[PDB]
Design a protein around this nucleic acid. Sequence first.
RNA 1: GAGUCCCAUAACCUUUGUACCCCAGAGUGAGAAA
RNA 2: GCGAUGAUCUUGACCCAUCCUAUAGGGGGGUGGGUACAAAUGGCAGUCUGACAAGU
Lengths: 121, 225, 200, 102, 162
Amino acid sequence: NPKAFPLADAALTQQILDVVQQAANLRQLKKGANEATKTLNRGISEFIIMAADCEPIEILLHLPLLCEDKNVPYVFVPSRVALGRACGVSRPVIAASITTNDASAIKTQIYAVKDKIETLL
Amino acid sequence: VVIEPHRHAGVYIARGKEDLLVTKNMAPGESVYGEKRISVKVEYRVWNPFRSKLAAGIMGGLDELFIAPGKKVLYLGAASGTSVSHVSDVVGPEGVVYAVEFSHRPGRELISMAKKRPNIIPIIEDARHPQKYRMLIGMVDCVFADVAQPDQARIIALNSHMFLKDQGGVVISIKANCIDSTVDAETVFAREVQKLREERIKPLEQLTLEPYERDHCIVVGRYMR
Amino acid sequence: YVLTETSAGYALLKASDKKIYKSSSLIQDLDSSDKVLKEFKIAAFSKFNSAANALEEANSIIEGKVSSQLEKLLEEIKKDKKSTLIVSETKLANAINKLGLNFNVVVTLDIYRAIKEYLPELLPGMSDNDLSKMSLGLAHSIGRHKLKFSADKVDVMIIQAIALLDDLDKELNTYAMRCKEWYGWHFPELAKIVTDSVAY
Amino acid sequence: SLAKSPASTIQILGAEKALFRALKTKHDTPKYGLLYHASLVGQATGKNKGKIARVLAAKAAVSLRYDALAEDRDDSGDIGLESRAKVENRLSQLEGRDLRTT
Amino acid sequence: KNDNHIIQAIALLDQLDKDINTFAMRVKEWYGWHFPELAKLVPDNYTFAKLVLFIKDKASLNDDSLHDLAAGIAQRVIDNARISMGQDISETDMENVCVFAQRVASLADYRRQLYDYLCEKMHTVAPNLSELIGEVIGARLISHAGSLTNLSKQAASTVQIL
RNA sequence: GAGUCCCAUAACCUUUGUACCCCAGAGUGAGAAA
RNA sequence: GCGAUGAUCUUGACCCAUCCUAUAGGGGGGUGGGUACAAAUGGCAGUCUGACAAGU
């Protein structure tokens, strides 16, 4: 998909799959495209991971629009089943938002990976 | 509720029981983005210095800002068609703004506002080939820039020496992070002012507009051929 | 001693800048780029303007944003090509396609700056506001359609289409009741027996 | 402008004041919105019509943003028809369900 | 000798004057997608819709005779048809706008012949009222009273109106 | 899991404008003008 | 050269003027307030929850 614009690679995709694993471990992420847009609407989500594998990709790429309108980071990993196993349900997951509280036990790596996303915009 | 004029006719202060900044209307009826209309009869549109970037530069102010109500304005700019409405509201029907954006995700809303506002000329090629949009423009009297993709100075340099006239004026919102993160504000800003005066645009003023948005200054410059 | 090509509103404007084929390219700002001075230097020669139609606008858009292959551009090319004179070319990407023709094509950016600043005063004779109106018309007409997809599947019309549905149903119910009352004054029975509006 | 919407909103894009008042008093929300007048949720019978209202909202969001943000789609309704067959066999396999015993 | 024609005749024509104003405004905002410039130059509803039925697509280009027959201002509209260009096309199904504008034309031409009908009907039913106060105020009076006999049996002080 | 159809096509209120009138009002009943 | 075929009739608050005591107040210049209608990217006004279900 040439229209899946920010797509990761091995190091940063491994880091974001690790941090989404720890976020699902303490259970403060949201799983699903419309739930990701709900979090984008109510401003809760720290950033968005999406899957540059969905058929067609326009089921997913609407939330980039309001995501950059609300200036949130948003990344593509190249496999929906990979980040589904990352988020810890048994289903192919198309998008996942990661919420925010400041008492979080993964706060510093969340901030590190979101600066890593913003380094490629 | 009383209207105060700035140095530039087109930017006013609606102050009174609430105090804020407004512009004129080149289109009556309604706020095209969802702000309040001050009524005096005469209508006045708020524009938020957060959701705009030139508006907070008016909250910075200038000895001579090159937007005047006869001064033809070019707007390379960010792709959103938000602030070009108020550049139109400043310039009135005698001047004209040419807004040039490439990514057509706000190109459609730009076309939508510019249909009901004949003050705006929408150019929908890239911001890097004025040789390609020659025939839709002639000898603009000012340029404004809000491009974030990192060859800001070189590409507004090419636009400013192709279309902006002699002894005209440039006004740029120079970003820090969108060209160079990890290096500080005044460093990358003085680097940009260095390459501008290398391109013989005489700089006049930079200021960071801090509480409205973080670490993006505006620089302004006289042009010298 | 030169002719220059510049596309202005829908056209190819050959402007005659009476100076040398090399010195007008060379000095070009010590040539006193003033209104009367460059107006007397760059005099009006030709303006191959096709029409104000959108098809001529499409020919102009293909000649501008891509290399010059317009038939109107060829017709303007067969209007001063008899001496291999200095025909100042405008675009830099449509320069090899300009050179692919039997002509003598040629800071020239600055003479185009001067030509552009003294075009709407006198050089076609046309109006400042009319040139800006034709330019904004061109931009709203065919620049957005040649970059973007279309506007044939535009969706803003369907809102007033369905508003016409709802208001036509409401208004037609009121007309039905008024006709049933008026002809019921001649026939008070049949509105009970055929309640259908259009059958009434 | 409705392509950038969650499918929950497209489940409830008509029953606005009923939804908001059933929030306001601590009461129970509606389940249809405007979508109740669709043929599939008409064909469903019970509260599984609310369930198929949810799944039709989801597949409508899918098909809706497909033909909204597509740039070259075939004007044919292919994945719309595919999702229609999906919700149709979903509907039959939930109308096979009956909570009363046999 | 029957005012039951006249009361619902006037209560019919004021309502249809309202909705032909509504439908002419809808024709205006629909044809703004084809002529966003014509709406300020030709403001009149009936002549507007009658020339919208005339010029379908922006292809006038040659004459002024038929445009003035629908009407100089014609010539300005003719030039602005090629200079405006803030306009879409939608020509393959603009024929519904062509049928709709002539539908407003047929409605507004049913009006004024209904108005001629009740001018005759107030000249025949209440001729003293039509001669003294006019047909419009006469029909409004007997409607606002309820009927002719009720208006008559009203006393002279309760002929108050708004 | 989860109250649409009480009409969000909305209902009310405000603002904009528009042709408007600014008097008692099951109006009072015999005076005005010199 | 009047009128039961209808005479008459109590006006929401004040800024320079025409009148009564070189400049200052009280009795046809200036004006608020409200009544019968169309529009709003005006306000009320906020766009449900999110992994289990079913059968053997």
